[PDB]
Amino acid sequence: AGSIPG
Amino acid sequence: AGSIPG
Amino acid sequence: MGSMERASLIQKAKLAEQAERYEDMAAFMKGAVEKGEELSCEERNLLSVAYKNVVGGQRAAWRVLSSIEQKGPEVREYREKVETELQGVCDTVLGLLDSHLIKEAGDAESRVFYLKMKGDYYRYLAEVATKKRIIDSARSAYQEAMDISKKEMPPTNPIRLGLALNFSVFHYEIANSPEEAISLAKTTFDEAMADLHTLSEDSYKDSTLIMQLLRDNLTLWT
Amino acid sequence: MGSMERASLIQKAKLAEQAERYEDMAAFMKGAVEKGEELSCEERNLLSVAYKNVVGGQRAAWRVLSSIEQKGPEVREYREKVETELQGVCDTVLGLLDSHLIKEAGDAESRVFYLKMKGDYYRYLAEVATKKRIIDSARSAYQEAMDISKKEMPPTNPIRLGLALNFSVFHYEIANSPEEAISLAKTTFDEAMADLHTLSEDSYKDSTLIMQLLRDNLTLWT
Ligand SMILES: *Cc1ccc(-n2ccnc2Br)nc1
Ligand SMILES: *Cc1ccc(-n2ccnc2Br)nc1
C-alpha cells in the first residue's frame, strides 16, 4: 500500500 | 574510472 | 541555525536536496521555520520533502530490524535505538507544526498542507507504537484537513488528492478499516476524474499522477 | 562505544549493514577497533564496508556541490561544510589504522588490507585537497601494499587485485599518470588470467569479478 512518495 | 565498489 | 539568514537556509536546503543530504536539508528547513515567518508554497514542499526522506530511511531501517527481531538483546536494543531516533524526528516535525506553523496558516492551501503533514507524522508514530491516542491524533488531523479541502479546494487539487491517498492508507494500514480505505480511494478517484476537463495540460499531469496512486492501491486492496 | 561488548558491536554492525544504516555501522566498527584486539578477516570487511559507504556518500555530495560551485557565498560555504565532514571521516579512519591496526598487522592478508585502506583514504583526501604530501602519502601506502602482495599473495588474490585496481585509479585520477595506470591494470589482469587454472569455482568467481573491473577501466582508458 503506497502513500505519497514525496 | 571505477574503484572497488566495496 | 539562528545565525544564518532565512534566505541562505532556503538556498542551502535546495543544495542539500540536489546532493541527497536530507538530514542537512531537514536541519536547514527547521532553521528556516524557526525564523518565525510563514512558509511559501515552495518552502512548504522543501520542509515536507526533507523530513519525508529522513523519516522514510528511519522507517525502512526500523522495518528491517523489527523483521529480524520477530524472526542476545542486541537486535531489540538496536531496533529500540532506531525507534527512538524515528520518534524524535516525528516529534520535531510535530513541534514545528504546533509552534507555530498551523496556527498561523489561514489559507486553505497552507492549512490543509500542514494538517496533512500532522496526520502523516502521527501515522509514522503509530506504526511503531505499542497507541490509541496516537492513532486518534492522526485521524483528527487528517479529518480536519479533509473537511477543509472538500470545502475549499477542487477535487483535482494535488494536495487534496495526496491527503485522501494518505488518509486511505491510514484507514487500511493503521485503523484496520480496509472498507473505509477502499471507499475513500474510489470516491476520491471518481470525483477527480469528473473534474479533469477543467484542467490545463500541466495540472492534468499533476492530478492524473496521484490518481494513478489511488488506482494502484485499489488494485492491491481489491 | 566503551561500555558495549566487542561482540555486541560486531553484531550490531552487521544489523546496521542490513538496515543500510552505514553511519551507525561505522560507529559500531570504530568502537570494535578501539577495543584494542586485532580484527578477523570478516571484521576487517565490516570496517571497510562501513566507512566506504559513509565516505562514498560524502564524496558524491561533494562532487554535486563542487560542480554547482564551478558553474552569494552559500554554495561555497556548504561545499566547505561537506568537505570538512569528509576530511573528518578520512582522518578518523586513518587514525584507526595508525592506532593501532597497521602496526599490529603481521600477516600479509591483514597488512595489505590495512595499507590498501590507508591508500584509499589519503586518495579521498587528495580528491578535495588544494596536496602533494597527501598524494605522496597515498602513493607510499599503496606502494608498500603492492610490494607485500607481490611477495606474499598469488596473482588472483582478491585483495591483491582490488589493491592494484585502486592503485591504478590513483595513477589515472590523482597522480596524472594514465600510462602507469594502464600498464598496472593490464599487467595485473594478465598475471591473474594465467593463475585462474589453480582456483576452485568460488575463488574463480571472486577473482574474475575484479578482473572485469580492471578490464572495464582499460576499455575506458584506451
Ligand atoms: C502530500 C503531497 C505531496 C506532493 C504532491 N505532489 C505534487 C506534485 N506531485 C506530487 Br506526488 N502531492 C501531495
Ligand atoms: C579492496 C577489496 C574489497 C573487496 C573485494 N572483494 C572481495 C570479494 N569481492 C570483492 Br569486489 N576485493 C577487494
Side-chain angles (χ1 to χ4, degrees), chain A, chain B, chain C residues 1-69 72-108 110-131 133-185 187-204 206-222, chain D residues 1-69 72-108 110-131 133-185 187-204 206-222:
Chain A
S3 58
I4 271 286
Chain B
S3 58
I4 271 286
Chain C
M1 296 276 177
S3 74
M4 215 189 305
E5 289 277 22
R6 191 184 186 278
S8 295
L9 291 166
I10 296 306
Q11 165 179 35
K12 286 183 187 179
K14 297 174 181 173
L15 294 176
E17 180 175 27
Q18 277 177 289
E20 285 171 15
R21 298 267 300 190
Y22 290 105
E23 191 173 313
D24 286 353
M25 187 181 182
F28 292 139
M29 293 300 314
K30 183 181 182 278
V33 170
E34 286 181 349
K35 297 301 179 184
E37 293 284 16
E38 304 185 19
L39 298 200
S40 70
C41 171
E42 186 168 1
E43 299 166 348
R44 290 195 295 275
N45 291 327
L46 291 165
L47 179 59
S48 175
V49 167
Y51 279 107
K52 190 86 86 195
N53 274 292
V54 172
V55 72
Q58 295 174 314
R59 295 159 75 207
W62 186 96
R63 291 181 332 252
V64 167
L65 294 180
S66 189
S67 174
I68 296 161
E69 183 175 20
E74 288 83 353
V75 169
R76 173 190 54 79
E77 281 169 353
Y78 185 42
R79 186 271 299 156
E80 287 176 356
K81 180 189 163 164
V82 174
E83 181 167 316
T84 302
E85 192 187 282
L86 187 165
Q87 293 167 325
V89 173
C90 290
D91 285 344
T92 295
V93 178
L94 292 170
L96 297 174
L97 290 173
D98 202 43
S99 295
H100 296 282
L101 286 172
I102 288 173
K103 67 172 57 68
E104 290 309 334
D107 294 353
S110 67
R111 192 170 188 86
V112 172
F113 188 89
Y114 293 133
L115 289 161
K116 171 185 178 189
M117 275 180 75
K118 181 179 180 169
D120 284 349
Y121 286 96
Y122 275 114
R123 177 154 61 83
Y124 303 152
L125 284 180
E127 286 176 343
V128 305
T130 60
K131 167 69 181 310
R133 277 193 263 281
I134 294 171
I135 287 172
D136 198 59
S137 291
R139 185 205 52 75
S140 178
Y142 283 135
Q143 191 55 63
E144 180 174 356
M146 302 270 300
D147 297 340
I148 296 166
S149 66
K150 290 202 299 302
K151 288 224 201 38
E152 292 305 340
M153 290 154 174
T156 47
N157 176 302
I159 304 298
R160 181 165 169 190
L161 290 175
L163 166 60
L165 177 74
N166 287 9
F167 197 11
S168 75
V169 166
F170 170 82
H171 286 310
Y172 197 95
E173 284 189 352
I174 308 297
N176 193 38
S177 319
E179 281 181 329
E180 187 66 16
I182 295 169
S183 184
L184 172 55
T187 295
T188 305
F189 181 98
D190 289 348
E191 295 179 71
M193 185 69 48
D195 192 60
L196 288 178
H197 69 91
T198 68
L199 304 183
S200 70
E201 172 182 14
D202 291 359
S203 300
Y204 181 88
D206 289 349
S207 296
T208 57
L209 167 47
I210 308 158
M211 294 177 51
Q212 178 69 26
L213 308 176
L214 288 165
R215 193 129 65 161
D216 297 338
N217 285 350
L218 284 163
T219 291
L220 218 72
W221 301 339
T222 59
Chain D
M1 296 276 177
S3 74
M4 215 189 305
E5 289 277 22
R6 191 184 186 278
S8 295
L9 291 166
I10 296 306
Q11 165 179 35
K12 286 183 187 179
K14 297 174 181 173
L15 294 176
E17 180 175 27
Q18 277 177 289
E20 285 171 15
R21 298 267 300 190
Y22 290 105
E23 191 173 313
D24 286 353
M25 187 181 182
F28 292 139
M29 293 300 314
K30 183 181 182 278
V33 170
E34 286 181 349
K35 297 301 179 184
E37 293 284 16
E38 304 185 19
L39 298 200
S40 70
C41 171
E42 186 168 1
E43 299 166 348
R44 290 195 295 275
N45 291 327
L46 291 165
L47 179 59
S48 175
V49 167
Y51 279 107
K52 190 86 86 195
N53 274 292
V54 172
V55 72
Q58 295 174 314
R59 295 159 75 207
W62 186 96
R63 291 181 332 252
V64 167
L65 294 180
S66 189
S67 174
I68 296 161
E69 183 175 20
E74 288 83 353
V75 169
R76 173 190 54 79
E77 281 169 353
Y78 185 42
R79 186 271 299 156
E80 287 176 356
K81 180 189 163 164
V82 174
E83 181 167 316
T84 302
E85 192 187 282
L86 187 165
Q87 293 167 325
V89 173
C90 290
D91 285 344
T92 295
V93 178
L94 292 170
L96 297 174
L97 290 173
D98 202 43
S99 295
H100 296 282
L101 286 172
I102 288 173
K103 67 172 57 68
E104 290 309 334
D107 294 353
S110 67
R111 192 170 188 86
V112 172
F113 188 89
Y114 293 133
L115 289 161
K116 171 185 178 189
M117 275 180 75
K118 181 179 180 169
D120 284 349
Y121 286 96
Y122 275 114
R123 177 154 61 83
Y124 303 152
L125 284 180
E127 286 176 343
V128 305
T130 60
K131 167 69 181 310
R133 277 193 263 281
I134 294 171
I135 287 172
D136 198 59
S137 291
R139 185 205 52 75
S140 178
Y142 283 135
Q143 191 55 63
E144 180 174 356
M146 302 270 300
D147 297 340
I148 296 166
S149 66
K150 290 202 299 302
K151 288 224 201 38
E152 292 305 340
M153 290 154 174
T156 47
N157 176 302
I159 304 298
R160 181 165 169 190
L161 290 175
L163 166 60
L165 177 74
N166 287 9
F167 197 11
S168 75
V169 166
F170 170 82
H171 286 310
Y172 197 95
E173 284 189 352
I174 308 297
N176 193 38
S177 319
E179 281 181 329
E180 187 66 16
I182 295 169
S183 184
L184 172 55
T187 295
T188 305
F189 181 98
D190 289 348
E191 295 179 71
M193 185 69 48
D195 192 60
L196 288 178
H197 69 91
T198 68
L199 304 183
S200 70
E201 172 182 14
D202 291 359
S203 300
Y204 181 88
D206 289 349
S207 296
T208 57
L209 167 47
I210 308 158
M211 294 177 51
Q212 178 69 26
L213 308 176
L214 288 165
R215 193 129 65 161
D216 297 338
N217 285 350
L218 284 163
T219 291
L220 218 72
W221 301 339
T222 59

